Design a protein around this nucleic acid. Structure first.
Ligand SMILES: Nc1ncnc2c1ncn2[C@@H]1O[C@H](COP(=O)(O)OP(=O)(O)O)[C@@H](O)[C@H]1O
Ligand code: BEF
Ligand SMILES: [Mg+2]
Lengths: 107, 88, 463, 98, 93, 95, 86, 107, 93
DNA sequence: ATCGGATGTATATATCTGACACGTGCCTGGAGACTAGGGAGTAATCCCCTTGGCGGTTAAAACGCGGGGGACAGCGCGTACGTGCGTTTAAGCGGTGCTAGAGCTGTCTACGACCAATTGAGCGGCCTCGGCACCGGGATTCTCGA
DNA sequence: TCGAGAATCCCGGTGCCGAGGCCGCTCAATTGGTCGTAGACAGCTCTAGCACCGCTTAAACGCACGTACGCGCTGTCCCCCGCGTTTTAACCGCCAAGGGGATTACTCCCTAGTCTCCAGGCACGTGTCAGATATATACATCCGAT
């Protein structure tokens, strides 16, 4: 016959063959069932879709049309859910949010 | 003339100069700094660089090399909790 | 041509320079560039300047005329433009970021000038208001900064627009013959414009059988395309030179440092380079930051004790004071001058130092005060890459090359510096070599890079 | 009739300027000498790449900026607007790092 | 020797989400390290879930429990709905 | 009688000496079943699981009060007040 | 069979119990506004640990939340509890 | 041939075969070198010997004979290096170091 | 069903160190969980050490590097010395 | 600032009490001996990449003098909490009894490991251009005297 | 109160340089037979959890009193910021060198796997003894008249 990729069967955009190889050859478990790489490719797709939607909007409100790490730092530290996930994580060339406490503003 | 003898090793933690520490504290949020922060800031920064460079030197002495690559500092920071994204 | 010695210049000519001018009046006549590559000393500047007014008084284009020289030699140009052809306007494009906008915008761009004299490293930082003008020549001087294929200065000098480019330089090729086509590419793009098609264009100068026919198929294209003349043909100094070697032995203090570099026993420094730390320790000991004993500062006549060459240097110097002479001391590392500066200040000796990054206006005043008659500064401390590239030092004779560089012709660029037209004493060159050490093999390496060019090409350049 | 600002405006305008942008607030070569000095006590005569020294610089800025945020929180707690050494020593005692 | 990344895959997801807004290479390196991080966390949690129950085999069900144990709050509902829909769409073919 | 500030230090020595549990069993166990019955209905608890939750909660609150005491002695007082606890959880990274 | 939720049991962490947990921790003198805050903090912690324990228990098909499930929830969050197993 | 257990070849007290089984049947790697479980059993013996020696002294300081977890709490927390190792561990039936602050003492 | 603990092994070490000391049951469970915890830390660090270098086998050498990374201060020197003495005595027999 | 004294824990001692250390059986994982082989050490080649220092810009660290504003010690003073007394009610205890679920097992079967032929998605390497970084000149606004 | 003046946001033009897009390999991801055994399903013992009863007593609740301290005010004082000249040292671009990272092939030997004995570890009764614990006595330690 002719080859038909499992990424095309599942309707995903991540290399399900590469996830299946990295689950056999990482020694994460002895035997990888076939249902797990499809599920894991789908979850990774959804997380990347979240961060890229937020990054695209926060980049577009500053009239610059390419995503640079400042936009990722904004699009993560604004939202509370991805802040709760990415707690310790430092992003290089990132910078700190506009954050001034209330008593330092002048009288 | 006496100009050569003042090139000496300077206790190079004085490379982290006073306006550098003030620019960090201005980014961070502090409006008004005291005048005794500076010795303590150099002490804290020397403790943190001792620990990360100790784990980097252990990962590099393991694989027999003599070149501390960027992947070793990323693994040494991942070791302690403070993950660092952007290098590999 | 030109058998009349054209005295529209306000000065003299020479019976060999007239022959040199005829090579210059034909290249523009045939619309090709050239390499005025005479052996140093015979005044390539006068042949350059008399070429200029020839195109002003005969071909009659006033022109914008960009020249480019290293930083030290800029003051030598604007004197001898005005010493010889005082009817030509000029610059000395210097100053801060302030003091160049008045020169360019207010006093250059309104066509209020003739000739711009910029440097190597201001032509990068001011390239944007200098591309507008179509030039007549880019008369680059001391053209050995263009020996790299993708350097910064070689990358900017293919964007300027002009008629010709007189790449008037001092020496031919230095290491390879990958060099000299890059000198010839940026002359005239119509000859090669091709990198891979030069390496085997003449069979690469004897990587196969050492044939001495390989150099012939080179030199049937660039012998009447280049000019270079024999020294004793012209009697440049009316005197030959004598290179001398003086083997010295190491002191035991730097020998204890020496075996802490090989076997690796004030201590615990960064010793991450082997050929460079040993270049320090076999020249002067105190460079390891702490070998000075006792108080935080204090000299002592002992300074010549530890160092293996200062007993050799100063005995040689106190020979020369008894003969009534003036010396020129070179170096390669700048920090070693800091010891010799404090040395002659300790053993009563007057001096002038031209280091890298003294200043601009400070290099001006030292040269005039050193070339004055009955000006009794005994020594004159220099460096190789900053000072020994075209300053005029006819009022001192003897040279003491304190160390050898990895380039054999870097010192050969600097040996012949004072030894030019105007030196009437006996030029005695002295090289200080530390016997049974590292610096002989960097002198042994330097002999082979010179014998490839001086013995194969120079015998085929006179042919 | 000169023109001097007050004692509380240039600091605020610097705060907005430096929270807006992302350079490296520590210079390169003093930090590189610092890192090579501390590395030549643990194993002698190592070689670094350049991007690993960049990595150490990025982590040090992250740790010091978080440290001065937490110090400023303790300082505004203690009825002051100034930071002091006792505040940094407190905000390192609280996290469990001493 | 090839360095392999997830560059074109992040780029395809960016073309499906936004129509034109391209990405710069430093952000591509950040998204690479992020996806490797989330993959290592989820693989580790499903791994020692399947080790605690004295099993030997990662199923889909352990991945679903590990997604409920790492993604906090309200990414969990959307992630588990996406996982179930993609696996059931995969099942028929 | 006693001065105000004596029975406090006697109780501090009595409680930093001994090792018992400081919350009653049945109110804490009914608290655990209340919070558990919003995630799955009809759960059952081994008795050592209730003991484990009581030990983890006591250790969490005791460490929290050490750090709140440090903040209140920092602020030139001797008395903890709710902004001290809110500070001591803003610094630690748990808010 | 049956099920009921009773009495709004956060008032079981009574006032002398919170005062004993403060007298152990080194506090001398306690305010009167701590008590709502301490109850809120304890309720947030128990929601997190029991959320993760019920996740493990519904995974492994059981219903009796055994002590290993609570110990693995505490190991997940970053507070190891020795003394109970595993 | 008879038997000569590896716990008597290495001269240990902690076993070897059990650690070799828990390295090759726990999926920490694919292949396990034969030198590794001896080294690992020796290191676990060293840490156990340190904590039981310090606990024996701390139990003798209150004149009882059976070590109870109050004594392990004090023996771990007084020594600074073990306190650095076990900084997160909550020990059940714990107890606290007796520590009173400096300003709470009566004036 | 038998369970793998470490009561008798800790009990042998205790009878070496202090010759007249008993030990209660909850202390035995704590030492069981302590030895299991330090085992899982050292095996985890050695596992991803040997996976980072693209090798495939835990030798004794990655165990030594894992111990030099985890154990702080003056425990590293005594621990590495104990291990090297044990393996060097093992090779001669 | 110092004795009378009033009340807290501390301790020696005496009697039970479970909890522990020890004696015996059962057996399943651990030693062992030969085999089969694929990973890892080792030597050679080569070639990108690091290092030290110098050269000329030029923006940034350093010093000094002056000045307004925050740290801080004392003083008053109003309230919120500790200490104590009595009353109550709910936790603890012990014991009974029911029963829902958890652990072990015996027996099929569908589900992933393994290999073998194959071809195309993915990745290194090379053009080519739109986003953008200055880049200086204009317009708006906030700061600070009056 | 209501003006003058520097810092900052836009605006059009440039020019530049890193991303988007193709070209040409190539190893790994699909397909298709084959086994081999982890896992699900029905089925039982059996035991720990839930519900519930009464009984005792120690701890929570509430209230009243006294006062040590939290907090606002207020004056003093010293010190940190702002401003402007200075020196200097970081930064970017040469310019040589070689130690060291990264292939590549060859061989060598240590581990996986197999079956076969065989005793160390785990569980289960049983002696026995360190410790909980009440009673009596004694030592430390706050607190008040002179
Ligand atoms: N016609 C001349 N009359 C006098 N001096 C001359 C003449 N031609 C050349 N010189 C001398 O040549 C020197 C400059 O030569 P220069 O251009 O430096 O030679 P090179 O180009 O070989 O270094 C000056 O010192 C000048 O005195
Ligand atoms: F370059 Be000339 F020798 F001054
Ligand atoms: Mg010249």
């Amino acid at each position: 016959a002719k080859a038909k990729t499992r990424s095309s069967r599942a309707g995903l955009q991540f290399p399900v063959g590469r996830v299946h190889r990295l689950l056999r050859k990482g020694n994460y478990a002895e035997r990888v069932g076939a249902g797990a790489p499809v599920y894991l490719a789908a979850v990774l797709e959804y997380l990347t879709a979240e961060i890229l939607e937020l990054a695209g909007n926060a980049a577009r409100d500053n009239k610059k049309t390419r995503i640079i790490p400042r936009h990722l730092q904004l699009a993560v530290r604004n939202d509370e859910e991805l802040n709760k996930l990415l707690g310790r994580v430092t992003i290089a060339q990132g910078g700190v949010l506009p954050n001034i406490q209330s008593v330092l503003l002048p009288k | 003339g006496a100009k050569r003898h003042r090139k000496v090793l300077r206790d190079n933690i004085q490379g982290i100069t006073k306006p550098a520490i003030r620019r960090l504290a201005r980014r961070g949020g502090v409006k008004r700094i005291s005048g005794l922060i500076y010795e303590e800031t150099r002490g804290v920064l020397k403790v943190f660089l001792e620990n990360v460079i100790r784990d980097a030197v252990t990962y590099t002495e393991h694989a027999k090399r003599k070149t501390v690559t960027a992947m070793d500092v990323v693994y040494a920071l991942k070791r302690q909790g403070r993950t660092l994204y952007g290098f590999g | 041509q030109f058998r009349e010695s054209p005295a529209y210049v306000n000065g003299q000519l020479r019976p060999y320079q007239i022959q040199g001018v005829n090579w210059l009046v034909s290249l523009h006549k045939n619309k090709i560039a050239g390499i005025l590559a005479d052996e140093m000393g015979l005044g390539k500047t006068l042949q350059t300047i008399s070429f200029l007014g020839y195109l002003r008084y005969i071909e009659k284009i006033p022109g914008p005329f960009l020249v480019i020289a290293p930083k030290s030699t800029l003051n030598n140009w604007l004197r001898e433009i005005n010493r010889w052809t005082p009817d030509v306007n000029a610059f000395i494009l210097q100053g801060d970021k302030e003091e160049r906008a008045e020169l360019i915008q207010k006093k250059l761009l309104g066509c209020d000038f003739d000739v711009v004299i910029a440097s190597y490293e201001i032509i990068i930082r001011e390239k944007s208001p200098l591309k507008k003008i179509n030039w007549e020549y880019i008369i680059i001087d001391e053209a050995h900064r263009i020996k790299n294929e993708e350097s910064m200065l070689s990358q900017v000098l293919r964007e300027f627009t002009s008629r010709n480019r007189l790449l008037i330089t001092g020496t031919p090729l230095q290491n390879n013959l990958h060099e000299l086509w890059a000198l010839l590419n940026f002359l005239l793009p119509d000859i090669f414009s091709d990198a891979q098609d030069f390496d085997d264009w003449f069979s690469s100068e004897s990587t196969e059988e050492d044939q001495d026919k390989i150099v012939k198929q080179l030199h049937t294209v660039l012998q009447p395309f280049l000019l270079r003349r024999i020294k004793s043909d012209v009697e440049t100094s009316l005197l030959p030179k004598k290179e001398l070697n003086l083997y010295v032995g190491m002191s035991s203090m730097q020998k204890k440092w020496y075996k802490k570099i090989l076997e690796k026993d004030e201590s615990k420094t960064r010793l991450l380079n082997i050929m460079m730390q040993l270049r320090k320790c076999c020249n002067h000991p105190y460079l390891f930051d702490g070998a000075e004993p006792g108080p935080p500062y204090t000299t002592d006549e002992h300074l010549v004790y530890n160092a293996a060459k200062l007993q050799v240097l100063d005995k040689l110097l106190k020979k020369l004071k008894e003969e009534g002479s003036r010396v020129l001391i070179f170096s390669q590392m700048s920090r070693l001058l800091d010891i010799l500066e404090d040395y002659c200040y300790f053993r009563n000796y007057e001096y002038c130092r031209i280091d890298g990054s003294t200043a601009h206006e400070d290099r001006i005043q030292a040269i005039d005060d050193y070339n004055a008659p009955d000006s009794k500064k005994f020594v004159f401390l220099l460096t190789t890459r900053a000072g020994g590239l075209g300053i005029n030092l006819t009022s001192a004779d003897v040279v003491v090359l304190y160390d050898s560089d990895w380039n054999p012709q870097a010192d050969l660029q600097a040996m012949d510096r004072a030894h030019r037209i105007g030196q009437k004493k006996q030029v005695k060159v002295f090289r200080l070599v530390t016997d049974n050490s590292v610096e002989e093999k960097i002198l042994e390496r330097a002999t082979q890079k010179l014998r490839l060019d001086q013995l194969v090409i120079q015998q085929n350049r006179t042919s | 009739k000169p023109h001097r600002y007050r004692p509380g405006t240039v600091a605020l305008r610097e705060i907005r300027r430096y929270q807006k942008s992302t350079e490296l607030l520590i210079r390169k070569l003093p930090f590189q000498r610092l890192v090579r000095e501390i590395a030549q006590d643990f194993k002698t005569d190592l070689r670094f790449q350049s991007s690993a020294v960049m990595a150490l610089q990025e982590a040090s800025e992250a740790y010091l900026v978080a440290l001065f945020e937490d110090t400023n929180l303790c300082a505004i707690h203690a009825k002051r607007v100034t930071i002091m050494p006792k505040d940094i020593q407190l905000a390192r005692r609280i996290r469990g790092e001493r | 020797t090839r360095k392999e990344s997830y560059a074109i895959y992040v780029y395809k997801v960016l073309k499906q989400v936004h129509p034109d807004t391209g990405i710069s290479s430093k952000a591509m390196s950040i998204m690479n390290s992020f996806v490797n991080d989330v993959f290592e966390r989820i693989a580790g949690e499903a791994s020692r879930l399947a080790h605690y129950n004295k099993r030997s085999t990662i199923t889909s069900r352990e991945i679903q429990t590990a997604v409920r144990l790492l993604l906090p709050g309200e990414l969990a509902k959307h992630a588990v709905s996406e996982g179930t829909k993609a696996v059931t769409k995969y099942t028929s073919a």
